[PDB]
């Protein structure tokens, strides 16, 4: 038969679903959350990424959310309720320089499965486009797993290329909706 290496799509470990949040106050938060499309290969990822707008070009109050097929971009989802997020705080000047660069590095960390065995703990990621300052976060399934959370946050910091002086905080979803850092790297 034919060597599949000449015609086959490069498959990912997980199928990923990209979501979009359009800020509307007349509707509830969940009503604004909409699904864009699903992909489970490398080519289909770039087929989606190339035709959508960058995070810097969105309106204030819009979110991109890339999660595993089956997990919704909210804390009340089974996979999310017991975990938390590695938050990256950006300023207004980092929208031009860092925002689109950090988000695509974040996207490649998810689909590329860059955290070894602890890539299974990863639920997804979401970029917040706000006028007061942009935010990027990687969500995990369990905040109690110390070894899992610490590895993801360390390797994620190394991928983005953040200086050692910059300190980022992991905060759980249960503490955010009731903020304090459970871990720092």
């Amino acid at each position: 038969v034919a060597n599949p290496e000449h015609y086959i799509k490069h498959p990912l470990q997980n199928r990923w679903a990209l979501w979009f949040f359009k800020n509307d106050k007349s509707k509830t938060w969940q009503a604004n959350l909409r699904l864009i499309s699903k992909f489970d290969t490398v080519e289909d990822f770039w087929a989606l990424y190339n035709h959508i707008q960058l995070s810097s070009n969105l309106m204030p109050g819009c979110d991109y959310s890339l999660f595993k097929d089956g997990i919704e971009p909210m804390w009340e989802d089974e996979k999310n309720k017991r975990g938390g997020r590695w938050l990256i705080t950006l300023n207004k000047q980092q929208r031009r320089s860092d925002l689109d660069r950090f988000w695509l590095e974040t996207l490649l960390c998810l689909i590329g499965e860059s955290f070894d065995d602890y890539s299974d703990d990863v639920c997804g990621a979401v970029v917040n486009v706000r006028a007061k300052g942009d935010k990027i976060a990687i969500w995990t399934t369990e905040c109690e797993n110390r070894e899992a959370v610490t590895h993801i946050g360390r390797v994620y910091k190394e991928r983005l290329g953040l200086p050692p002086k910059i300190v980022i905080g992991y905060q759980s979803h249960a503490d955010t909706a009731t903020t304090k850092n459970r871990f720092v790297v």
Binding site: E43, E105, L108, G112, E113
Partner: peptide, 14 residues
């Protein structure tokens, strides 16, 4: 099981 390098993935952009 299925893992990729960042520089391998960037080559499939165009």
């Amino acid at each position: 099981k299925k893992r990729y390098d960042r520089e391998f993935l960037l080559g499939f952009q165009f």
